[PDB]
Structure formats: C-alpha cells, structure tokens
C-alpha cells in the first residue's frame, strides 16, 4: 500500500551515466516498480535475470532494490553474469554468486561514442588482489609492483592503474559502448518496500 511510481527514469534515462570503476548506485525504496515500462524504451538486447523470472515480474514484491549503473565494452557484457573471470569482473565490478537481480545492457554507441575516441570512460587494469563482491575502487594510486619502490612517474616497470576506453564509431559490435544497469534484490526476511501493480 504505497501507490507511487519508482524513479526508473533516473537510472535508465540519465544524461551522464557512470564510469566503469566508479559505477553509480541509486537505491530505490517505498515505490511501485512496473518493469513492463522497460519494454517500451530503447531495445534492450540483453535482459538476463538470474533467479528473478523477468516475464511476469510485476507480481513480485521486493524489500531493498539496489540499482547500479555503468558503461562497458561489448564483449565484456558477458562478464556481468554472477561468477566469471576476465578483467572487469575481477578488478572493476564483480557480482556474488547469489545475485538475485536483473542485468539490462543496451548498446549506447549512438550517444557514447565520438570521433577519435570518447576518453570519458576509465576502467581499472592493474590491481593487487581480485575485487570482492560489491566493492567500488574509487582510489587511483600508482600501482607499484612489489619489487622496487616507485614514485609519481611512469617508466618500464612502473605504470598507472586506470586506462581509457576508446569508443570510436568505426568499431564493430563488441568494442562499442554498452550501458549496463544491474538491479540487486535482497528479498530477505523484512517488511517489503517495493512492490508491483496489483
């Protein structure tokens, strides 16, 4: 008994979407969530829920929904699945192997790819240990290998952790930008706050 629409237009229709290592999080609560509205927007070529039954989802209440958003490449969308190796599922954004949520990834090469490359999306490349479930590495320190100390320079054995995606419109499907929004549903023992139309 809430009778209020959730602000899904703030995580699916935002001007500045997110970064890879600085993925945005907008927790939703105390509102009615009708996921069918997602079928009227741009064609979502990737809608793979993991334990959520995407079809007939309006008839399901949720306790705490966490909507995370970021932008990745094309061949790296398959790493947002719960449990996978690679480069962004180990040092940028990793999901637990209990993820009862939905990953919606849509191609954004129409507005997130400019001439000579869009360098406004950075992804982490060098990190000591693998990223733990739901950890955001907002820090950027010079990755000094544990052999010889380094300083604020760049050389043969000393480099920078973050890299720069080059989203050019002359790239085929796989290197084009893709906006990915993951909805994590708690569904634990607690009074629910987000339900559907019923």
């Amino acid at each position, epitope marked *: 008994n809430i009778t209020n629409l959730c602000p899904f237009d703030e995580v699916f229709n935002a001007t500045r979407f997110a970064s890879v290592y600085a993925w945005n999080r907008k927790r939703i609560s105390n509102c009615v969530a009708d996921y069918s509205v997602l079928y009227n927007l741009a064609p979502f070529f990737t809608f793979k829920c993991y334990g959520v039954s995407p079809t007939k989802l309006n008839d399901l209440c949720f306790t705490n929904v966490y909507a995370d958003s970021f932008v990745i490449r094309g061949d790296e969308v398959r790493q947002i699945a719960p449990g996978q190796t690679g480069n962004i599922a180990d040092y940028n954004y990793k999901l637990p192997d209990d993820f009862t949520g939905c990953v919606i990834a849509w191609n954004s090469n*129409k507005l997130d790819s400019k001439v000579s490359g869009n360098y406004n999306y950075l992804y982490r490349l060098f990190r000591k240990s693998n990223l733990k479930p739901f950890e955001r590495d907002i820090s950027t320190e010079i990755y000094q290998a544990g052999n010889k100390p380094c300083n604020g320079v760049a050389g043969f054995n000393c480099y920078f952790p973050l890299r720069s995606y080059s989203f050019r419109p002359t790239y*085929g499907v796989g290197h084009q930008p893709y906006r990915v929004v993951v909805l994590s549903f708690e569904l634990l023992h607690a009074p629910a706050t987000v339900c559907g139309p019923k």
Partner: antibody
Amino acid sequence: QVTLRESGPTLVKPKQTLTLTCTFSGFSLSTPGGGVGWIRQPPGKALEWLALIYWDDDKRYSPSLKSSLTITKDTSKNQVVLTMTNMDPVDTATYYCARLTAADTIFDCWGQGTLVTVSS
Amino acid sequence: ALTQPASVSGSPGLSITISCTATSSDVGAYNYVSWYQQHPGQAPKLMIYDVSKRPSGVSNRFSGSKSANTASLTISGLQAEDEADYYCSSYTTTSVVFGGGTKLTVLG
C-alpha cells in the same frame, strides 16, 4: 525548428584569421550526443569536414589541419565560434555549420553557408 | 576516403543506385553512413541516414543498402525535381569523410 545561421566577414585578407560564427536556435547544445561542426565546400568541389564540438567541451579537428582550427562554444548566448589562422588563397569556399544530433545521424540539419573568399 | 561515380544518368521513373565504395579501408566496420542531397544553389539536405532508417520528411523513394562494405543509395521513381548532387559520408578512425560527388541527369 532547428535553425543554424552563419555570420562573420566574407572577405578576408590573405594570411589572417577568420571569425566565422554560427548561431543555433531550436535545441540545447547540452544534450548528450549532440554537437555542432563545420564543413568546407570549395566552388565546384566536394565537402570536407573541418572541426567539431560536443556536449562536453570536446573539440575534434581534421587530422590534416590542427595548427589553425580552433572551435569554441558560448552556450550562454547560443553561438559557436570558429577561428582558423594562416588564410591561404585556396580556402575560398562556402562554409556550413551543421548539427550532429547523434553518432548515427551525421550532421542532419545544415545551415545556409557563407562564401568566404581570400583575395588580395 | 570514399569514391562515388561522377556522372549518373536516369530515365524518368526508372530506379538507379549510387555506389559508395570505401577504398583504403580505414573506415572500420562501416556501420554509420548518411546520404545528403544538394541542389545547385542550396545547402546539403540529409536524404537518408544509416542504411536502414529514414528521416521525417523524405518519401519512400530513397532507400539504403550495404552489401559487404559498399553503401548504396537506391532512388526509384525519378522526377524532374531530383537532379542534384548526392554525397555519402561516414566516419573514419580520425575524421569524418564526406566522399565525392554524384550528378544525376534525368533526360527528357
């Protein structure tokens, strides 16, 4: 209702700097994916892209000309300014400013173009 | 760059095609390509953006195709008010190429 009107002096002395301005009305340049560029068209020749600006102050230029082309935005008054130095008697052409709505729609709406001549 | 046929003739009503070959293929996947029309004395007007798409205000007489790496503008049902210069433009790895020109001569 997109309207892109060019301005600036048509005649320019050789070896100087142009001040070709483009007033755009009917859209906001802050839209994600938008942008205003410039296309040169010599009399009796083909089109050639010169410069381009985006919604995040990103300035792209032609790889052949990067030491003279300078584009800037003045969204406070909706006026994109383009300045190029070292005007040679080969740049006499009809300059256009077209809006780049998105990456898929390359320069959909064009202006009217101004004939800039370089003669002593 | 992009090469186009210089002169193209067409009888009133028949269908013609304009080839946009990407010689020196640094164009990449060649995903986006837009065809503009320019009458003598006016500004280039976009006839058809990406090969399967049509802007509001253009009739179904214009269509686009791309067999393997060559864009083709199919114009069917020619009229007297169609003799204009057509330009195909795509994206390169570092610039925005605009190709050459193509003059349509509707005899009669």
